[PDB]
Design an enzyme around this catalytic site. Structure first.
Site, PDB file in Angstrom:
ATOM      1  N   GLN A  32      73.398  27.724   2.808  1.00 40.07           N
ATOM      2  CA  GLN A  32      73.299  29.096   2.315  1.00 40.07           C
ATOM      3  C   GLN A  32      74.457  29.938   2.831  1.00 40.07           C
ATOM      4  OE1 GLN A  32      69.140  31.375   0.963  1.00 40.07           O
ATOM      5  NE2 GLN A  32      71.222  32.158   1.361  1.00 40.07           N
ATOM      6  N   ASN A  87      35.550  36.284  33.384  1.00 40.83           N
ATOM      7  CA  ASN A  87      35.586  36.603  34.806  1.00 40.83           C
ATOM      8  C   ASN A  87      36.774  35.958  35.502  1.00 40.83           C
ATOM      9  OD1 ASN A  87      32.084  35.998  34.614  1.00 40.83           O
ATOM     10  ND2 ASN A  87      33.122  37.979  34.437  1.00 40.83           N
ATOM     11  N   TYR A 105      43.313  38.220  43.832  1.00 46.54           N
ATOM     12  CA  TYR A 105      42.318  37.217  43.475  1.00 46.54           C
ATOM     13  C   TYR A 105      42.961  35.854  43.286  1.00 46.54           C
ATOM     14  CZ  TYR A 105      38.610  40.610  42.796  1.00 46.54           C
ATOM     15  OH  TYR A 105      37.655  41.581  42.976  1.00 46.54           O
ATOM     16  N   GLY A 116      29.071  40.689  38.613  1.00 49.77           N
ATOM     17  CA  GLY A 116      29.763  40.309  37.426  1.00 49.77           C
ATOM     18  C   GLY A 116      30.620  39.071  37.610  1.00 49.77           C
TER      19      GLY A 116
HETATM   20  C1  F43 Z   1      37.869  50.837  44.664  1.00 46.49           C
HETATM   21  C2  F43 Z   1      36.899  50.356  43.571  1.00 46.49           C
HETATM   22  C3  F43 Z   1      36.551  51.463  42.566  1.00 46.49           C
HETATM   23  C4  F43 Z   1      36.292  50.700  41.290  1.00 46.49           C
HETATM   24  O1  F43 Z   1      35.838  51.159  40.247  1.00 46.49           O
HETATM   25  N1  F43 Z   1      36.800  49.469  41.431  1.00 46.49           N
HETATM   26  C5  F43 Z   1      37.554  49.299  42.672  1.00 46.49           C
HETATM   27  C6  F43 Z   1      39.062  49.451  42.431  1.00 46.49           C
HETATM   28  C7  F43 Z   1      39.522  48.526  41.320  1.00 46.49           C
HETATM   29  C8  F43 Z   1      40.921  48.710  40.778  1.00 46.49           C
HETATM   30  C9  F43 Z   1      41.918  49.069  41.877  1.00 46.49           C
HETATM   31  C10 F43 Z   1      43.002  50.061  41.452  1.00 46.49           C
HETATM   32  C11 F43 Z   1      42.617  51.495  41.661  1.00 46.49           C
HETATM   33  O2  F43 Z   1      43.401  52.413  41.541  1.00 46.49           O
HETATM   34  O3  F43 Z   1      41.331  51.667  41.824  1.00 46.49           O
HETATM   35  C12 F43 Z   1      41.057  47.331  40.108  1.00 46.49           C
HETATM   36  C13 F43 Z   1      42.518  46.877  39.917  1.00 46.49           C
HETATM   37  C14 F43 Z   1      40.311  47.241  38.757  1.00 46.49           C
HETATM   38  C15 F43 Z   1      40.875  46.211  37.799  1.00 46.49           C
HETATM   39  N2  F43 Z   1      41.577  46.675  36.778  1.00 46.49           N
HETATM   40  O4  F43 Z   1      40.660  45.008  37.973  1.00 46.49           O
HETATM   41  C16 F43 Z   1      40.350  46.458  41.117  1.00 46.49           C
HETATM   42  N3  F43 Z   1      39.483  47.105  41.770  1.00 46.49           N
HETATM   43 NI1  F43 Z   1      38.296  46.206  43.242  1.00 46.49          NI
HETATM   44  N4  F43 Z   1      39.705  44.778  43.597  1.00 46.49           N
HETATM   45  C17 F43 Z   1      39.749  43.808  44.514  1.00 46.49           C
HETATM   46  C18 F43 Z   1      38.772  43.502  45.481  1.00 46.49           C
HETATM   47  C19 F43 Z   1      37.649  44.317  45.659  1.00 46.49           C
HETATM   48  C20 F43 Z   1      36.551  44.090  46.665  1.00 46.49           C
HETATM   49  C21 F43 Z   1      37.000  44.544  48.060  1.00 46.49           C
HETATM   50  C22 F43 Z   1      36.109  44.032  49.189  1.00 46.49           C
HETATM   51  C23 F43 Z   1      36.186  44.880  50.423  1.00 46.49           C
HETATM   52  O5  F43 Z   1      35.028  45.047  51.010  1.00 46.49           O
HETATM   53  O6  F43 Z   1      37.222  45.347  50.846  1.00 46.49           O
HETATM   54  C24 F43 Z   1      35.404  44.942  46.074  1.00 46.49           C
HETATM   55  C25 F43 Z   1      34.405  44.180  45.202  1.00 46.49           C
HETATM   56  C26 F43 Z   1      33.232  43.641  45.969  1.00 46.49           C
HETATM   57  O7  F43 Z   1      32.569  44.558  46.622  1.00 46.49           O
HETATM   58  O8  F43 Z   1      32.966  42.460  46.015  1.00 46.49           O
HETATM   59  C27 F43 Z   1      36.173  45.946  45.268  1.00 46.49           C
HETATM   60  C28 F43 Z   1      35.646  47.150  44.919  1.00 46.49           C
HETATM   61  C29 F43 Z   1      36.226  48.172  44.134  1.00 46.49           C
HETATM   62  N5  F43 Z   1      37.257  48.012  43.363  1.00 46.49           N
HETATM   63  C30 F43 Z   1      35.626  49.576  44.081  1.00 46.49           C
HETATM   64  C31 F43 Z   1      34.996  49.930  45.440  1.00 46.49           C
HETATM   65  C32 F43 Z   1      34.550  51.385  45.600  1.00 46.49           C
HETATM   66  C33 F43 Z   1      33.555  51.859  44.581  1.00 46.49           C
HETATM   67  O9  F43 Z   1      32.329  51.683  44.991  1.00 46.49           O
HETATM   68  O10 F43 Z   1      33.843  52.659  43.718  1.00 46.49           O
HETATM   69  N6  F43 Z   1      37.402  45.478  44.937  1.00 46.49           N
HETATM   70  C34 F43 Z   1      38.956  42.261  46.272  1.00 46.49           C
HETATM   71  O11 F43 Z   1      38.010  41.612  46.704  1.00 46.49           O
HETATM   72  C35 F43 Z   1      40.309  41.607  46.213  1.00 46.49           C
HETATM   73  C36 F43 Z   1      40.918  41.614  44.821  1.00 46.49           C
HETATM   74  C37 F43 Z   1      41.063  43.067  44.376  1.00 46.49           C
HETATM   75  C38 F43 Z   1      41.579  43.370  42.962  1.00 46.49           C
HETATM   76  C39 F43 Z   1      43.095  43.523  42.820  1.00 46.49           C
HETATM   77  C40 F43 Z   1      43.930  42.356  43.284  1.00 46.49           C
HETATM   78  O12 F43 Z   1      43.451  41.205  42.897  1.00 46.49           O
HETATM   79  O13 F43 Z   1      45.068  42.493  43.681  1.00 46.49           O
HETATM   80  C41 F43 Z   1      40.931  44.752  42.771  1.00 46.49           C
HETATM   81  C42 F43 Z   1      40.623  45.019  41.290  1.00 46.49           C
HETATM   82  C1  LIG Z   2      37.380  41.940  28.301  1.00 42.95           C
HETATM   83  C2  LIG Z   2      36.243  42.224  29.254  1.00 42.95           C
HETATM   84  O1  LIG Z   2      34.995  41.992  28.522  1.00 42.95           O
HETATM   85  P1  LIG Z   2      33.703  42.917  28.775  1.00 42.95           P
HETATM   86  O2  LIG Z   2      34.143  44.000  29.742  1.00 42.95           O
HETATM   87  O3  LIG Z   2      33.312  43.460  27.415  1.00 42.95           O
HETATM   88  O4  LIG Z   2      32.660  41.996  29.364  1.00 42.95           O
HETATM   89  C3  LIG Z   2      36.237  41.330  30.508  1.00 42.95           C
HETATM   90  N1  LIG Z   2      35.947  42.137  31.686  1.00 42.95           N
HETATM   91  C4  LIG Z   2      34.803  42.005  32.394  1.00 42.95           C
HETATM   92  O5  LIG Z   2      33.961  41.152  32.130  1.00 42.95           O
HETATM   93  C5  LIG Z   2      34.647  42.889  33.420  1.00 42.95           C
HETATM   94  C6  LIG Z   2      35.660  43.556  33.959  1.00 42.95           C
HETATM   95  C7  LIG Z   2      35.733  44.038  35.375  1.00 42.95           C
HETATM   96  C8  LIG Z   2      36.853  43.425  36.152  1.00 42.95           C
HETATM   97  C9  LIG Z   2      36.374  42.519  37.272  1.00 42.95           C
HETATM   98  C10 LIG Z   2      35.966  43.293  38.516  1.00 42.95           C
HETATM   99  S1  LIG Z   2      37.031  43.001  39.957  1.00 42.95           S
HETATM  100  S2  LIG Z   2      36.860  44.713  41.020  1.00 42.95           S
HETATM  101  C11 LIG Z   2      35.312  45.432  40.406  1.00 42.95           C
HETATM  102  C12 LIG Z   2      34.113  45.102  41.273  1.00 42.95           C
HETATM  103  S3  LIG Z   2      32.621  45.849  40.686  1.00 42.95           S
HETATM  104  O6  LIG Z   2      32.365  46.969  41.544  1.00 42.95           O
HETATM  105  O7  LIG Z   2      32.837  46.132  39.296  1.00 42.95           O
HETATM  106  O8  LIG Z   2      31.473  44.829  40.761  1.00 42.95           O
HETATM  107  C13 LIG Z   2      37.570  40.578  30.683  1.00 42.95           C
HETATM  108  O9  LIG Z   2      37.686  39.474  30.115  1.00 42.95           O
HETATM  109  O10 LIG Z   2      38.428  41.098  31.424  1.00 42.95           O
END
Ligand code: F43
Ligand SMILES: C[C@@H](OP(=O)(O)O)[C@H](NC(=O)/C=C/CCCCSSCCS(=O)(=O)O)C(=O)O
Lengths: 296, 259, 194, 47, 495, 220
Positions: free
Chosen positions: E93, E426, E278, E390
């Site tokens: 072409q 999860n 994680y 969860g």
């Molecule tokens: C700070 C929060 C608020 C909320 O809605 N989720 C949080 C925060 C959220 C945000 C953090 C960013 C921010 O600006 O908030 C994200 C990234 C959500 C997501 N998109 O996956 C996250 N957590 Ni959480 N979150 C984590 C973790 C954890 C562990 C922390 C254990 C402790 O006692 O210190 C626990 C869950 C549990 O109780 O089992 C936890 C809780 C919580 N997590 C609760 C705790 C306070 C609440 O009652 O509101 N994270 C972890 O266990 C490690 C991995 C880590 C994830 C990010 C990463 O993988 O780098 C992050 C994952």
């Molecule tokens: C797409 C979405 O589906 P669903 O929310 O409709 O189940 C699905 N998310 C989930 O099942 C749940 C999301 C929460 C993120 C995992 C939590 S790690 S930190 C939060 C700790 S807690 O205080 O929420 O127990 C996914 O594949 O990411």
């Protein structure tokens, strides 16, 4: 008698461990609590070393043997600019700190250049006040060779530079030049370990020199006595309020204001002025204490 | 009838878990916090004022006739229409008297109309506000289920269930809701459970001695009580796992002969 | 051109491949002129935006101390509805170590509402002029809205004894600061110091 | 610039009415309705 | 004395650097984020842009329909042509435009064959030599599996998959293959045989890294949600460079974590911060390595590498022993507990070690997941906590679904993936599942897990990402010394 | 560390002993005669050449209750002792349950001073009819976990300490009657742990005002 080590553990029940150390007669030279872990540089008698290891393993602590935790090192950099200070110089200082030593960055006023580099008398004396000086030089053989007049101090010396091998009449460690990254490669770590081994060998030699004619009182117990007697040492804002040298101490308090109080401190049955040389330091007008030997 | 056991095991941890699960076991009380102080730490309503409602009282509203729905007697908070609130606790991994799944199981075994949620470093129960306050004072705070050092009523920022304790044996807190008063040896809550400061700190007693913590904890630990020292719990867990596997493979009486 | 001696900290860094500074530590530069305050020893603050300012000042001929705050991350407890995530604070020893310097340079982040209250709590105990080095464009008046003494916009009821003397915007955390920002900081320090 | 006028801050544009002028340290200062001092050089009249 | 303005220091451990398992490199936690790490991005790019096409039906069409004779010289000419056409050069072409070669320097068309006689007289520039890249026994196994068949590996430029999505790759390869075929053998540009080539290269002989997910999932092919666990096990090339079964399983665990838990789950199905801590929990410190080595030692001490046939009793024994050991280690060393502060991290690590141990004992992947689920529900009773709520959805239905035979629940763990109904949401499960699937075959010393063609294709030395040592490459990317493709600086102004 | 003296000779038994008991002789004999009779104190203090005077009961069999000064060093440096005796019926006789409530009995011994001397002193803190509550020590009442809590109605003449459950933790008290609801300190049974009982001497708790000290003797 008193071998100095570092204990790394938690703050929970650390007060009981400090009580045990006080009971067996040790001294806590250094203490730092980060968030929940505490690092303690402790000097305890040799006959209680195994006892302290057993006690530390009860609190799930860790004992790290620090071969340099009784000396202060003068890391001499040609300048405090971006070329040497924020990298290499800090790596040298922090690696020295990792083995218990107390470093002091000495940035020469006119240390940079090839034929325009010079070292002042005040900087010379300030370097001499330390136990050992580490020079952090460049990475060109000609520049280093035309710079030997910098390393003119009657102190143990270790020179670091870029080229792997130098022909200077001093101890030299290669592959540590002027860089711009954090020292994290295997070769760089090995060169840092080589520098540590050289300074350790020099310090152990000097320790034998001192052990030929031991001082009347150890520096660590002298520091403890000064802390117990002088009540102004807890108001010092410097990083190390009292520095433990090889054969003396550095008191970070004003000399004009506190030399008479320091001299008139009774240890044992002696007055401090009769067993140590108390003099003003070139270091921010601090007090420098040099212990006398049992011969006099 | 059926006299219920509650948990397998012979160690002290299994016995404590059974005690928490048992509704007829009277938990030993170790402090006295007034109802108003609990309400203040909870931080949802001002003590002395009436409960806010979400709907009219159940008598005012009209519902269709439902024989099965009317068999269950509602809570008083439900009868008056009070809003649903929560109380949250963080438990230290170092011999805290109550632990998340243990808390949730005991709550759903002992209380009516509760919503319990379990996380690794968190545990929350939701109920109507009046009943929530009642059982928060009676069971959750005054008894051995709560230790002011190793456990803490805290929403918002929970962190420190797995960290080491501080110099006073208290769990780590990033907001510092509770502080240790060395003069009196008592723990005082200087903030409510979400983190807003309290006008007057509330005394929640003194930390439980560590020997008593070893005796009343519900967690298994290598230093205190190992799961290896309780082979009966491991056997029951393995039995549950095998029963689940066999039922998911082919759920017949023949495949369960290999149980 | 004069000799510059630094009192290195007495404690080591963060592990093997980690940072060289440690939280809650102070490194006196003997002659106390400028103290650079870093919120943490982490990569977001140390050697990327902070040691660069340090070597810029040390190149200008002005001795510098670097202080790493014990708790520099978060917002103060006095912020509206309290703090969240973490609590910002200043220790009395940290305040005393700062207050023996002629001037202070402090590095802040992105969110405006965090920076204003952090600066208010910082200047509640610091009585020397300070320079705020942040990323976001923040105006030298929002600090006065919550009570902070400010060179251009004073408050009617000052809640701080320290004066925010200059605000420099465009310095990102964890990234190398260009020579232009260093020159601006040096000029501000020189004109507001001697 | 006088009491009751309308001024705006050049850096942000906040609108307010001048409350009083309270000189201090041989330096003029302008107080607006938000109880915040300003500088005359950083303020200008609008209509 | 209570001063409310002192504050609370926090996050001391997170300030310290993260070592990388089996390496000697220390990196910050911020540099292990998939957006901040060019090595993880290049890993996903290299997996995404790979399509394997079986060039045997096309040869048969050329021989029996078009009457054209196919010889190794003609195949060499065809390879020369397609290496020019696949990046975007013009072959027919007149008057076309072409893509800049600087943007497609990572674009290769490679050929491998299980026929040694044909592989002998083939241009070694375009040849993936199975004999040279694999040890003798592994090379023989791979050749026996592949057979006397010729395959073409097309690696379309990374820029293509970055501008577009992952469904572009197969179509790109098919168009360029058809063009190179019609221009290398001097055929008519468009006839029935051209349609035969197009159909063969589009679906009959094509091998996709990931299947499409139509419907609710709504995604195209070659997306991380379509990559099965066995396929990812075959992508990792540690099996041909190391003989340590635990090391191979752990490299697969690291790759699976970095792909699924970070990219797929924290970006494709979530957003923002993602799940970095994680996933890094499984490949940063030797915690998982130490637990897995303990599991292997225990299994070899009482069972052997394949000394027992998969039964329930061995699953219970190995999984329980490894879980108890891991939790005891967490209790004994506060450094380990503060490293894995979240319960999910700990649960995943202990369960991964238990599943790897069961796989090393029995050589069955479904027994491995059964052990993983037993470990989860034993962790729950040991510490009275599992993870974020969860987290244990799939862990509760797992035991029932691991050996199930029902349509929606049955699948060999090699054939499972992120689109398995239980695993679809999860974090903290999928990378360890891939590692367990790999460990099922590392116990037997197998050359491959699910697809020999994928193993041979990713043994190619010209790939930008080195899949022999994934953790080393991740560390290199974290230290800003990994060169990645897909960058467009020749078409951009100077900044 | 507060140095209290020195070991003069025979150091080797201390140097080489790692566990167990070592026989020690204290050169200044402990001049604390509180569980003795007045004649024993007389003869022991005159054999040490110390001027002596009586304060309370003068009888030779009167039990000493307080001595001024009570420290051996003060006595030796001042060369005089003021010994106070008590009436035979004014001494309260108590029995302490050490096996039943170890922590509470240890706290009671510490607060009443029975750890050091043979006669302890209890101070009346609050009084009403049947109830007489004693003072507490807010330094030894730390691990006051519920130890010996009543199961049935408390009988008369029972000494009890309120545990950490109640707000008034550590306050000791006794009542001369019996009730089935409240302990000797006004708290419910779950908030009181029984430490001991008054065995022999009574009807002096009803004639002692607030702030006055009663003296106790352990009879096991
Ligand atoms: C700070 C929060 C608020 C909320 O809605 N989720 C949080 C925060 C959220 C945000 C953090 C960013 C921010 O600006 O908030 C994200 C990234 C959500 C997501 N998109 O996956 C996250 N957590 Ni959480 N979150 C984590 C973790 C954890 C562990 C922390 C254990 C402790 O006692 O210190 C626990 C869950 C549990 O109780 O089992 C936890 C809780 C919580 N997590 C609760 C705790 C306070 C609440 O009652 O509101 N994270 C972890 O266990 C490690 C991995 C880590 C994830 C990010 C990463 O993988 O780098 C992050 C994952
Ligand atoms: C797409 C979405 O589906 P669903 O929310 O409709 O189940 C699905 N998310 C989930 O099942 C749940 C999301 C929460 C993120 C995992 C939590 S790690 S930190 C939060 C700790 S807690 O205080 O929420 O127990 C996914 O594949 O990411």
């Amino acid at each position: 008698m008193y071998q100095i080590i570092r204990y790394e553990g938690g703050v929970y029940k650390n007060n009981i461990l400090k009580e045990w150390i006080e009971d067996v007669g040790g001294f806590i030279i250094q203490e730092h609590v980060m968030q929940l872990d505490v690092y303690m540089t402790i000097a305890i008698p040799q006959n209680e070393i195994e006892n302290f290891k057993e006690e530390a393993k009860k609190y799930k602590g860790k004992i790290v043997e620090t071969p340099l935790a009784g000396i202060e090192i003068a890391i001499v950099s040609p300048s405090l600019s971006r070329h040497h200070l924020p990298h290499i110089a800090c790596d040298v200082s922090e690696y020295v700190r990792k083995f218990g030593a107390k470093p002091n960055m000495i940035g020469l006023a006119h240390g940079a250049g090839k034929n325009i580099s010079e070292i002042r008398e005040k900087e010379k004396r300030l370097i001499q006040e330390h136990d050992i000086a580490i020079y952090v030089m460049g990475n060109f053989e000609s520049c280093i060779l035309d710079k030997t007049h910098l390393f003119k101090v009657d102190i143990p010396l270790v020179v670091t530079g870029g080229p792997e091998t130098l022909d200077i009449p001093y101890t030299y460690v290669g592959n540590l030049g002027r860089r711009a990254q954090r020292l994290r490669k295997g070769e760089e770590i090995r060169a840092l370990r080589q520098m540590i081994d050289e300074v350790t060998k020099k310090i152990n030699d000097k320790r034998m020199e001192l052990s030929y004619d031991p001082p009347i009182i150890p520096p660590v117990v002298l520091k403890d006595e000064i802390e117990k007697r002088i009540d102004e040492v807890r108001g010092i804002l410097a990083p190390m309020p009292i520095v433990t040298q090889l054969d003396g101490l550095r008191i970070k308090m004003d000399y004009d204001r506190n030399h008479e109080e320091i001299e008139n401190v009774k240890i044992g049955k002696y007055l401090l002025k009769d067993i140590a040389y108390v003099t003003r330091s070139e270091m921010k007008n601090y007090i420098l204490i040099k212990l006398k030997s049992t011969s006099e | 009838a059926y006299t219920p056991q509650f948990y397998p095991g012979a160690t002290k941890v299994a016995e404590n878990r059974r005690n928490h699960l048992n509704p007829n076991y009277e938990l030993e009380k170790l402090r006295e916090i007034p109802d108003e102080d609990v309400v203040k730490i909870m931080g949802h309503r001002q003590p002395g004022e009436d409960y806010k409602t979400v709907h009219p009282p159940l008598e005012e509203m009209d519902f269709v006739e439902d024989y099965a729905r009317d068999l269950v007697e509602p809570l008083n908070g439900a009868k008056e229409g009070h809003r649903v609130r929560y109380i949250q606790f963080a438990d230290s991994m170092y011999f805290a008297p109550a632990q998340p799944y243990d808390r949730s199981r005991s709550y759903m075994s002992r209380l009516r109309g509760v919503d319990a949620g379990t996380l690794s470093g968190r545990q929350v129960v939701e109920c109507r506000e009046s009943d929530l306050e009642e059982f928060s004072k009676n069971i959750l705070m005054d008894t051995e289920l709560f230790d002011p050092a190793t456990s803490g009523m805290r929403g918002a920022t929970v962190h420190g269930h797995s960290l080491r304790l501080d110099e006073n044996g208290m769990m780590f807190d990033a907001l510092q809701r509770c502080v240790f008063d060395e003069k009196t040896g008592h723990v005082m809550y200087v903030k409510d459970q979400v983190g807003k400061p309290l006008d007057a700190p509330v005394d929640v007693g003194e930390p439980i001695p560590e020997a008593k913590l070893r005796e009343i904890t519900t967690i298994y630990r290598n230093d205190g009580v190992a799961m290896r020292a309780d082979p009966d719990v491991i056997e029951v867990v393995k039995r549950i796992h095998r029963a689940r596997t066999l039922g998911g493979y082919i759920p017949t009486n023949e495949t369960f002969k290999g149980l | 051109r004069k000799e510059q001696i630094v009192d290195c900290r007495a404690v080591m860094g963060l592990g093997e491949g980690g940072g060289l500074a440690q939280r809650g530590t102070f490194a006196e530069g003997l002659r106390n002129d400028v103290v650079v305050v870093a919120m943490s020893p982490g990569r977001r603050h140390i050697t990327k935006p902070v040691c660069e300012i340090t070597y810029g000042i040390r190149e200008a001929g002005i001795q510098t101390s670097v202080l790493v705050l014990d708790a520099g991350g978060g917002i103060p407890s006095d912020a509206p509805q309290g703090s969240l995530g973490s609590t910002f604070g200043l220790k009395p020893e940290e305040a005393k170590q700062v207050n023996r310097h002629k001037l202070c340079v402090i590095h802040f982040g992105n969110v405006k509402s965090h920076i204003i209250y952090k600066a208010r709590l910082f200047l509640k105990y610091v009585d020397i002029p300070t320079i705020i080095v942040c990323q976001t464009p923040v105006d030298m008046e929002d600090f006065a809205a919550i009570g902070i003494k400010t060179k251009n916009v004073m408050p009617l009821e000052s809640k701080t004894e320290g004066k925010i003397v200059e605000i420099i915007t465009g310095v990102i955390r964890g990234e190398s600061a260009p020579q232009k920002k260093i020159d601006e900081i040096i000029e501000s320090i020189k004109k507001h110091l001697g | 610039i006088e009491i009751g006028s309308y001024v705006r801050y050049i850096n942000t544009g906040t609108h307010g009415t001048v409350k009083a002028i309270e000189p201090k340290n041989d330096e003029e200062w302008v107080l607006l309705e938000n109880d915040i001092y300003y500088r005359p050089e950083l303020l200008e009249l609008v209509e | 004395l209570y001063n409310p303005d002192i504050g609370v220091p926090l996050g001391q451990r997170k300030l310290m650097p993260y070592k990388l398992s089996n390496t000697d490199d220390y990196c910050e936690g911020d540099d292990l984020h998939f957006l901040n790490n060019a090595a993880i991005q290049q890993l996903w790019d290299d997996i995404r842009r790979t399509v394997i096409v079986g060039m045997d039906t096309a040869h048969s069409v050329l021989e029996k329909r078009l009457g054209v004779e196919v010889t190794p010289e003609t195949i060499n000419e065809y390879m020369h042509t397609i290496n020019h056409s696949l990046p975007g050069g013009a072959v027919v072409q007149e008057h076309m435009v072409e893509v800049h070669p600087s943007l497609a320097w990572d674009c290769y068309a490679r050929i491998f064959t299980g026929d040694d006689e044909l592989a002998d007289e083939l241009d070694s520039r375009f040849l993936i030599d199975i004999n040279k890249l694999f040890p003798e026994e592994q090379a023989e196994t791979l050749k026996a599996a592949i057979g006397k068949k010729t395959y073409q590996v097309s690696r379309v430029p990374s820029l293509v998959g970055r501008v577009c999505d992952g469904g572009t790759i197969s179509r790109w390869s098919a168009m360029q293959i058809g063009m190179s075929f019609i221009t290398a053998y001097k055929l008519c540009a468009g006839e029935a045989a051209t349609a035969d080539f197009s159909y063969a290269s589009k679906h009959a002989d094509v091998i996709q890294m990931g299947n499409a997910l139509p419907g609710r999932r709504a995604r195209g092919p070659n997306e991380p949600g379509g990559i099965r666990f066995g396929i990812l096990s075959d992508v990792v090339q540690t099996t041909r460079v190391s003989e340590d079964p635990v090391e191979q399983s752990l490299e697969v665990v690291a790759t699976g974590a970095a792909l699924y838990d970070q990219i797929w789950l924290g970006a494709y199905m979530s957003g923002g911060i993602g799940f970095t801590q994680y996933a890094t929990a499984s490949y940063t410190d030797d915690i998982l390595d130490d637990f897995s080595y303990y599991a292997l030692d225990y299994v070899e001490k009482k069972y052997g590498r394949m000394g027992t046939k998969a039964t329930m009793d061995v699953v219970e024994d190995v999984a329980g022993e490894v879980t108890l050991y891991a939790l005891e280690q967490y209790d004994d060393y506060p450094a380990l507990l503060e490293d894995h502060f979240g319960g999910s991290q700990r649960a995943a690590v202990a369960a991964a070690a238990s599943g790897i141990g069961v796989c090393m004992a029995t050589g069955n992947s479904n027994a491995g997941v059964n052990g993983w689920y037993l470990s989860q529900i034993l962790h729950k009773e040991y510490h009275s906590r599992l993870g974020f709520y969860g987290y244990d959805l799939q862990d509760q239905c797992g035991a029932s679904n691991s050996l199930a035979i029902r349509n929606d629940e049955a699948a060999p763990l090699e054939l499972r993936g992120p689109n398995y109904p239980n695993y679809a949401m999860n974090v903290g499960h999928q990378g360890e599942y891939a590692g367990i699937a790999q460990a099922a075959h590392s116990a037997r010393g197998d050359a491959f897990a699910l697809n020999p063609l994928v193993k041979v294709a990713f043994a190619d030395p010209m790939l930008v990402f080195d899949f022999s040592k994934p953790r080393k490459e991740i560390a290199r990317g974290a230290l800003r010394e990994f060169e990645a493709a897909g960058e467009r600086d020749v078409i951009l102004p100077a900044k | 560390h507060t140095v209290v003296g020195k070991v003069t000779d025979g150091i080797e038994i201390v140097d080489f002993s790692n566990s167990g008991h070592i026989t020690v002789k204290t050169n200044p004999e402990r001049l604390s005669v509180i569980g003795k009779t007045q004649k024993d104190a007389k003869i022991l203090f005159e054999k040490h050449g110390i001027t002596l005077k009586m304060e309370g009961n003068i009888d030779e069999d009167a039990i000493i209750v307080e001595q001024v000064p009570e420290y051996t060093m003060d006595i030796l440096k001042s060369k005089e002792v003021t010994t106070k005796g008590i009436e035979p019926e004014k001494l309260l006789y108590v029995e302490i349950y050490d096996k039943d409530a170890p922590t509470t009995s240890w706290y009671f011994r510490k607060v009443t001073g029975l750890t050091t001397k043979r006669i302890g002193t209890l101070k009346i803190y609050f009084k009403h009819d049947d109830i007489s509550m004693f003072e507490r020590d807010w330094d030894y009442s730390k691990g006051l976990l519920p130890e010996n809590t009543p199961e049935k109605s408390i009988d008369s003449g029972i000494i009890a300490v309120t545990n950490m459950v109640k707000k008034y933790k550590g306050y000791i008290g006794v009542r001369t009657s019996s009730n089935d609801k409240y302990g000797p300190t006004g708290e419910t049974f779950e908030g009181t742990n029984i430490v001991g009982k008054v065995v022999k001497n009574s009807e002096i708790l009803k004639s002692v005002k607030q702030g006055e000290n009663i003296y106790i003797l352990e009879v096991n």
